[PDB]
Design a protein around this nucleic acid. Structure first.
Lengths: 94, 99, 79, 94, 92, 91, 81, 77
DNA sequence: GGTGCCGAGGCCGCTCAATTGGTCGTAGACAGCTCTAGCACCGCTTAAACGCACGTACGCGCTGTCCCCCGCGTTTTAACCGCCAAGGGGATTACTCCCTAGTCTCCAGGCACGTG
DNA sequence: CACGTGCCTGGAGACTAGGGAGTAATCCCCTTGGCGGTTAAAACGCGGGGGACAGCGCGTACGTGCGTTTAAGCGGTGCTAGAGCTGTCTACGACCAATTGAGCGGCCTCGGCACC
C-alpha cells in the first residue's frame, strides 16, 4: 500500500535504462528512503520546536537537510530542492 | 501539468511524501513547500544511490541490482557511507579489504 | 549441551575470515560466544517487550527491526 | 601452506554474501534465549532471519575491529585481549 | 518551568543535612527533562507502532522497560505501578 | 486535591502532563501516563540524589556539586550504562 | 582576520589533558595529531551550531544551539539547558 | 573540576573556525564555555582510549598510531 | 558452449488516493522599541608557556625457543529439504461505552522577596 | 538556607460530547511438530612449521628542572548589534465536498542466470 517501487524503477530507468531492479533491492531502498525521510522530518521537527514554531515549512526542511547531509552532497541536494520549489513557484503565472 | 510531482518536475511523488509527513506526526502543521523539498531531496538521494549501484552491477557484469550492489554503492562512496554508517543491509556482504 | 555450542568453531572461523583475520587463537571462540549471547540478549529483551506491548504472543520481524533500531544498528532488508 | 588457504578463504567469503551460521542451531539458540523473558513464544521465520542477519553483521564488524587492534600490536593472531579491548573502546562494555 | 523546588523537597526527605547548589539544580533539571523526553519519545513510538494514538499507562510501562534495563526496569516498574494503583484507591 | 497528593508522590503530575502535551509525542495522552512518568522520575531522581549525597558525605561537603553528580552517575554501573554518553559541566 | 590560531592549544595544555586522561608518557608527535583531531571535532560541532543559528535567523551562536548540536553529535551536555 | 585549555586561545580558535561557515558571526560566552567543556571531555575520553591502546601494545608512551587506532575503532574518521 | 526456470516487464481494469475549488481562523511574517550583552580597547602582572641541558627510562631491532594453530584425511552427526497435520494465534469487522479533548469557574502552592 | 509574606498563573473539579479502542466472533496463514532421505559439515587426530613471547643491547627521545619571555586574566570603560518583546495585519494551511486519473494487481512474454 505504502511503498516506492514504481518510482525507484522510474529513476533507475532514467539513469541506467539498461538495468532492472530486484525485489530485495526494491525492499532495501524502500526502507532506506523511509529511514532518510524519517530522519530529515524529525530533524526539521526539532528545528521547528527549537524556535517555538509549530510549522515545518521549506526553510525548516532545507536547514535540516543541510544540517544532516554535510559535504558536497548536501549542497547538491539543497540546490535540487531549491530548483524544485522554484519550479513549483513558477506556476504562479496566473 | 496536473499533480504536484509533475508540476515541480519530480519523479518522486510529492503527495505521498506529504501524506507520510502528516502521518509521522513530526509537527502540528506541514507547510506547502516541505513535501516538495523533501521529494526533491529524496529523488536526488535515490538517483545517486541507484547510479552507484548500477555502476557496481556493470563492473560485476550483472544486469540486476541486488542488495549487494546497494551495499557496495553505499560503502565505496565516501559520503553515503558517512550518512549510512550504522546501517546493515540484508544480504549485503562486506567489501574485500584483506587488511 | 548449552545450545550455545550451535555457534560452533568453524561457524566462527568462517565469520572471522569474512571479518578479515588471518589467524585465530584457540581461546577466541569462548569469548566470541559470550559476545554473541550478550548481544542476542540485548536485542531479544527488546524484541520481546515490543510484542508484549502489542499484546502479541509471537515475535515478528518488525519488532526485531525496531529493537535493532533502538540499539543503533538499523536493518533495511526487513520491513 | 600454513597461510594461503586462509587468504583464499578470506577472498571467497568477503566476495560472497550468504549466511555463515547454520540456520537451525541459531534458531534453537534464539528460541532458548527468548524463552527466559516470556515463556511459550513463537517466532516468525522472518524475525529469526532478521536476527541472524543482524548478529552476523555485528560479529563480522567486531572481528574486523579486533583484527585492527591485533595487527596494531605487531601480531596476526587475534586473542581475547584484542576482542576485549575492541569492545572496551567501542563503548559496548568492558 | 523547573523542578528545583521538587528537587529540594526530595533531597530534604532523604538527606536531612544536605542542600543542593544552583549548578546542581540546573544539571538535575536538564537530566530530568532529558529522561522524560526519552521516555515520552519511546512511548509515542510504541503507540504509533501499534496503530494507536494514545499514550496510556501501558505505553509508558512498556517504554521504561525499553530504556531502563533489568536493574531498575524490574524495580522502577514496581515503584511506578503503585502510583497509578494508589489513584484508583483514592477515587473510590 | 492535587494528583500528586493522590499518588503519594512529590513530582508534579500536572507539570509532567503539561510537558507531555507540549512535547507532542502523540495526539492523545492517557490519564495514567503522567502519573506513571512522575513515579518513574521520582524513583530516578531519588536514586541519583541518594548517590550524590553519599558522594558529598564521602567528600565531607554539605553542598552537592555537579562533580558529585558525575561521580554518582559514573560510579553506579547501571546509571553509568543509562548515562554513559553524558558530559556534565564543571565536572 | 584570525589566522593560525590552532596553535593556541599549547603543548602544556595537551599534556595536562593527557595526564588527566591517565597516560604517563607522551610522544612528541601526539601534539600535532591532537590539534588535528580537535580541529576536526570543533568544525563538526560548530558547523551544526551555526546551522542552528541560521535557522532561527540569528547572528549570535546561543549556547542553546551548541547544546543542540552536541546532542546531535551523540555527546549530550547538561548544565546549559 | 577545572578548565585545562586557556579560555582566550580557545575562544579565538572557535571564532576563527566559525568565520568560515558564516562571516561576521557572534558568540555568547555561554556557547564558548559549552564548547570548551565538550572539547575537554572529548579529548580526555580520546586520551583514555589512547592510553588503553598504548598499554595494549606493551607500550607506555602514547603515539600517533594509538590515536589513529582509537579513532578508527570508535567509528569517527 | 547449451539449457530450463523464475522473476521482472508491459497492457488493461479500477479504485482509492490525489487533485481542485472554496472557507475560515490563526500562526506567523513584519515593523518598531528597548536594553543587555557582546565586542574593542586601555594597562599590570603574574601565572603560564617557552627555550635549553641533561641523564635516563624506554622503544625498537635481533635472536632463540617452544608451542599452538593450520591443513588435511577420516568418521560421525545433524542440518537441510520435501511433505503432511493441525491448531494457535494474526487480522477484520460490528458495536458500544467508556476514556479523553475542550471549556467554564475556582483556588492554592510554588515563585519570588524579605529577613537574622 | 531556612522561615514568614504576598501573590498569581497554572492546576483542579464539574460538565459536555465525541470518537478510540476494548470486546467478541470468525476466517485462515502460518508456525510448530513430526518423519524420512541424503549428505554436507563438523568433530577428531596428528604432524609440522610459523610466530608469540621473553631476553638483551643500543640509542634516542622525553620528563624534569631552571631562566626567559609572554600574553591571559583581571577590571574598568565605552559603544552599539541585535535578542527579545509587543502590536498588528494577512497569507496560509487545515478542513470539507466533489472529481478524476495514477498506480496497483492480474495476466501473458521473455531474458538472466545458475547449472553442467
Amino acid at each position: 500500500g505504502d511503498s516506492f517501487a514504481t518510482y525507484f524503477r522510474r529513476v533507475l530507468k532514467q539513469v541506467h535504462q539498461g538495468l532492472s531492479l530486484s525485489r530485495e533491492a526494491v525492499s532495501v531502498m524502500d526502507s532506506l528512503v523511509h529511514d532518510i525521510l524519517d530522519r530529515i522530518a524529525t530533524e526539521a521537527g526539532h528545528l521547528a520546536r527549537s524556535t517555538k514554531r509549530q510549522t515545518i515549512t521549506a526553510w525548516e526542511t532545507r536547514m535540516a537537510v543541510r544540517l544532516l547531509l554535510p559535504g558536497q552532497m548536501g549542497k547538491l541536494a539543497e540546490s535540487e530542492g531549491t530548483k524544485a520549489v522554484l519550479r513549483t513557484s513558477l506556476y504562479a503565472i496566473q | 501539468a496536473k499533480t504536484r510531482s509533475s508540476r515541480a518536475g519530480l519523479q518522486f511523488p510529492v503527495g505521498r511524501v506529504h501524506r507520510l509527513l502528516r502521518k509521522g506526526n513530526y509537527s502540528e502543521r506541514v507547510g506547502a513547500g516541505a513535501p516538495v523539498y523533501l521529494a526533491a531531496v529524496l529523488e536526488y538521494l535515490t538517483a545517486e544511490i541507484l547510479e552507484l549501484a548500477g555502476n557496481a552491477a556493470r563492473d560485476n557484469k550483472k544486469t540486476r541490482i541486488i542488495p549487494r550492489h546497494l551495499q557496495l554503492a553505499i560503502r565505496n562512496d565516501e559520503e553515503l557511507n558517512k550518512l549510512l554508517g550504522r546501517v546493515t543491509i540484508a544480504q549485503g556482504g562486506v567489501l574485500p579489504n584483506i587488511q | 549441551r548449552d545450545n550455545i555450542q550451535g555457534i560452533t568453531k568453524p561457524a566462527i572461523r568462517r565469520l572471522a575470515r569474512r571479518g578479515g583475520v588471518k589467524r585465530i587463537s584457540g581461546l577466541i571462540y569462548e569469548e566470541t560466544r559470550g559476545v554473541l549471547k550478550v548481544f542476542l540478549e540485548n536485542v531479544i529483551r527488546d524484541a520481546v517487550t515490543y510484542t508484549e506491548h502489542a499484546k502479541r504472543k509471537t515475535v515478528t520481524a518488525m519488532d526485531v527491526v525496531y529493537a535493532l533500531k533502538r540499539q543503533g544498528r538499523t536493518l533495511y532488508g526487513f520491513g | 601452506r600454513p597461510g594461503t588457504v586462509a587468504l583464499r578463504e578470506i577472498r571467497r567469503y568477503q566476495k560472497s554474501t550468504e549466511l555463515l551460521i547454520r540456520k537451525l542451531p541459531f534458531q534453537r539458540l534464539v528460541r532458548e534465549i527468548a524463552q527466559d523473558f516470556k515463556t511459550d513464544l513463537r517466532f516468525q521465520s522472518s524475525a529469526v532471519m532478521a536476527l541472524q542477519e543482524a548478529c552476523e553483521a555485528y560479529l563480522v564488524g567486531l572481528f574486523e575491529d579486533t583484527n585492527l587492534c591485533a595487527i596494531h600490536a605487531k601480531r596476526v593472531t587475534i586473542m581475547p585481549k584484542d576482542i576485549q579491548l575492541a569492545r572496551r573502546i567501542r563503548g559496548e562494555r568492558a
